[PDB]
């Protein structure tokens, strides 16, 4: 019993538009693969997680116009929400060309939270740093996003580089 | 003085060792060492030798395929094994890379399912890193149980634990039939 992911994606253009206006951000929102089908029981559950990722992109990712110009970047930020099938799973991606997740900030927070000390933090790989955002209570919150995705028997990944932006990938079972 | 030494202090004995293991395992290997002058804490150098040997043996044994197998695959008859060290920020990064058969990801997934760590639906959504990370989970692999029969730690256990005792980190990257790359990051200190 599947339905097009458009049942999830449809309310986003409006919400992204309002969030950007409200945060004085200029964002061009692009949705791809809205016809991609997924279990209808996933529809309600996955909406909240995706909205949070979109909000993070507009809030923490896309920089104010003045800052983007200072970086030699396109004046308007780009936010892409896509869906597609990859074998036996539905792949959903949220990608922005914003400032990227501040990895030093994450390390500092992890240390203060008592999750690691200075010594071990110094050698963490970029991916190991980003994964701290998945720890329950670290942060709503990427930790809750990961938990909900997991409750759907899915998986989540994060990719982010300074000034390039951030891409969050969610994989849900194709059942 | 400074308690620092070029990593060559340990790298130096590998060329001959690799040459030997290569023939003892009946294989032809193109062994490349890079950045042997990279300096790091002497304690790290004295401790990292065991782990590196474990990774090199893994590459020659489980990775690089016999001449006959590589030709059948469409790869050069001789495999390549690269051991390098370099400075990166305030860390020293050591890599062991081969162009062998690669980690059997489907085998890991099937084992994870058999052990009940995940079901078929979840297995289908796992990312490459999540799959490979199972190699660092204690009590996972069956061979781990094999090596432990002799009262000794298995390769991944020894490598991971020795590295962590130095406050270092370790990651594994691998693609189907395209090889394996193990990266170790150690502090400068
Ligand atoms: N470079 C590489 N290429 C392909 N497979 C590799 C590899 N390094 C490790 N592996 C695989 O991962 C599994 C475990 O390696 P690990 O070093 O823990 O155990 P081991 O089976 O080699 C026995 P021991 O380490 O005690 O000799 C291996 O058995 C092999 O299948
Ligand atoms: N798209 C993004 N671009 C830049 N930074 C991000 C992005 N998404 C998340 N972050 C960073 O990761 C940290 C956590 O995100 P999250 O767990 O969602 O928490 P929150 O909105 O409550 O701070 C954030 O505090 C922010 O610094
Ligand atoms: Mg081994």
Residues 6+ apart with CB under 8 A from B100: B59, B62, B63, B64, B65, B79, B179, B180
Q: Whose CA is nearest to atom 22 of ligand 2?
A: A141
The secondary structure of residue A40, as a DSSP letter, is: G
Q: Flag if A119 and B168 touch (Cβ within 8 Å).
A: no
Contact B59 CB / ligand 1 (< 6 Å): yes
CA separation for the pair B40, B42 (Å, rounded): 6
Query: Do residues B129 and B108 make contact, with C-beta atoms less than 8 angstroms apart?
Result: no
CA separation for the pair A84, A93 (Å, rounded): 9
Geometric angle at alpha carbon A138, from B126 and A41, rounded to 5°: 45
Question: What was the resolution (in A) of this experimentally determined structure?
Answer: 1.6
From the centroid of its chain, how far is CA A149?
12
- The dihedral sign for the CA sequence A95, A97, A102, A103: positive
Task: Tally the domains of chain B.
Answer: 1
Q: For residue A175, give the nearest of B121, B126, B186 by CB distance.
A: B121
Tokens read off for B163:
């590295």
Closest atom of ligand 2 to CA, residue A94: 1
> A161, A43, A38: which is closest to A95 by C-alpha?
A161
CA separation for the pair B123, A175 (Å, rounded): 13
Resolved by: X-ray
Helices and strands (H and E) in chain A: how many: 8, 7
Tell me whether A38 touches chain B (CB under 8 Å).
no
Tell me whether B128 touches chain A (CB under 8 Å).
no
Q: For residue B127, give the nearest of A88, A153, A157 by CB distance.
A: A157
Tell me whether A124 touches chain B (CB under 8 Å).
yes
Residues 6+ apart with CB under 8 A from B86: B34, B35, B38, B92, B93
Which conformational region is residue A100 in: left (phi greater than 0), alpha (psi within -120 to 50 degrees), or beta?
left
Q: Residue B98 pairs with which residues in a beta bridge? A: B81, B180
Residues 6+ apart with CB under 8 A from B105: B128, B131, B132, B174, B176
Q: Which helix (H) or strand (E) holds B126?
A: none
CA trace torsion A70, B90, B86, B127 (10° rounding): -70
152-171 in chain A: CB under 8 A from chain B: 153-155, 157, 169, 171
Tokens read off for A130:
């980003």
For chain B, the C-alpha Rg in angstroms (whole number) is 17
CATH code, A30: 3.30.565.10
Q: Which helix (H) or strand (E) holds A13?
A: helix A12-22
> A95, A98, A92, A80: which is closest to A30 by C-alpha?
A80
CA separation for the pair A140, A146 (Å, rounded): 11
Tokens read off for A144:
């809750």
Query: Do residues B38 and B95 make contact, with C-beta atoms less than 8 angstroms apart?
Result: no
Please tell me the distance in Å from B124's CA to the nearest CA on chain A.
Answer: 6
Helices and strands (H and E) in chain B: how many: 9, 7
**What is the DSSP pairing of strand B39-41 with strand A89-96?**
unpaired
CA separation for the pair B56, B152 (Å, rounded): 18
Q: For residue A155, give the nearest of B127, B169, B183 by CB distance.
A: B127
Residue for token pair 């001959």: B16
CA separation for the pair A49, A171 (Å, rounded): 13
Please tell me the distance in Å from B111's CA to the nearest CA on chain A.
Answer: 18
Query: Do residues B109 and B126 make contact, with C-beta atoms less than 8 angstroms apart?
Result: yes
Three-class DSSP category at B88: strand
Whole domain around residue B166: which residue ranges?
Answer: 1-189
Residue for token pair 């899915």: A154
Please tell me the distance in Å from A122's CA to the nearest CA on chain B.
Answer: 7
> B146, B184, B180, B183: which is closest to B60 by C-alpha?
B180
Please state, in angstroms and as integers, the Cα–Cα distance from residue A29 to each residue in A15, A32, A75, A78, A169, following that order.
10, 10, 14, 6, 17
Residues 6+ apart with CB under 8 A from B142: B111
CA separation for the pair B165, A113 (Å, rounded): 22
When scoring A83, A122, A131, A148 by the number of chain B Cβ atoms within 10 A, the one with the most, hence best to mutate, is A122
Query: Do residues A45 and A170 make contact, with C-beta atoms less than 8 angstroms apart?
Result: no
CA separation for the pair A80, A75 (Å, rounded): 16
**What is the DSSP pairing of strand B29-34 with strand B79-88?**
parallel
Tell me whether B186 touches chain A (CB under 8 Å).
yes
Phi, psi of B45 (to 5 degrees): -60, -40
CA separation for the pair A124, B168 (Å, rounded): 8
Three-class DSSP category at B102: coil
Q: Which long-range contacts (CB under 8 A, 24 or more apart) does A145-148 make?
A: A145/A49, A145/A52, A145/A53, A148/A45, A148/A46, A148/A48, A148/A49
Pick the residue from chain A with its C-alpha nearest to B167: A120
Tell me whether B84 touches chain A (CB under 8 Å).
no
Three-class DSSP category at B87: strand
Q: Which ligand is nearest to the CA of B82?
A: 1
Query: Do residues A65 and A154 make contact, with C-beta atoms less than 8 angstroms apart?
Result: no
Residue for token pair 């270092």: B168
Residue for token pair 């990064």: B93
CA separation for the pair B95, B85 (Å, rounded): 7
Burial group, residue A102, by CB count within 10 angstroms (0-12, 13-18, 19+): middle
């Amino acid at each position: 019993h599947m339905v097009p992911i458009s049942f999830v994606f449809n309310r986003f253009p409006r919400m992204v538009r309002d969030l950007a206006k409200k945060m004085n951000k200029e964002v061009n929102f692009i949705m791809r693969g809205e016809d991609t089908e997924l279990d209808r029981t996933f529809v309600e559950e996955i909406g909240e997680p995706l909205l949070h990722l979109l909000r993070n992109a507009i809030d923490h990712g896309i920089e104010p116009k003045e800052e983007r110009i200072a970086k030699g970047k396109p004046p308007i930020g780009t936010l892409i929400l896509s869906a597609r099938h990859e074998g036996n799973n539905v792949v959903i991606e949220v990608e922005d060309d914003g400032r990227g997740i501040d990895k030093e900030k994450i390390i500092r927070k992890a240390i203060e939270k008592g999750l690691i000390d200075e010594s071990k933090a110094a050698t963490l790989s970029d991916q190991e740093i980003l994964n701290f955002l998945f720890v329950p209570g670290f942060s709503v919150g990427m930790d809750v996003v990961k938990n909900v995705v997991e409750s759907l028997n899915g998986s989540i990944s994060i990719e982010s580089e300074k000034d390039k932006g951030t891409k969050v990938t969610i994989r849900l079972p194709l059942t």
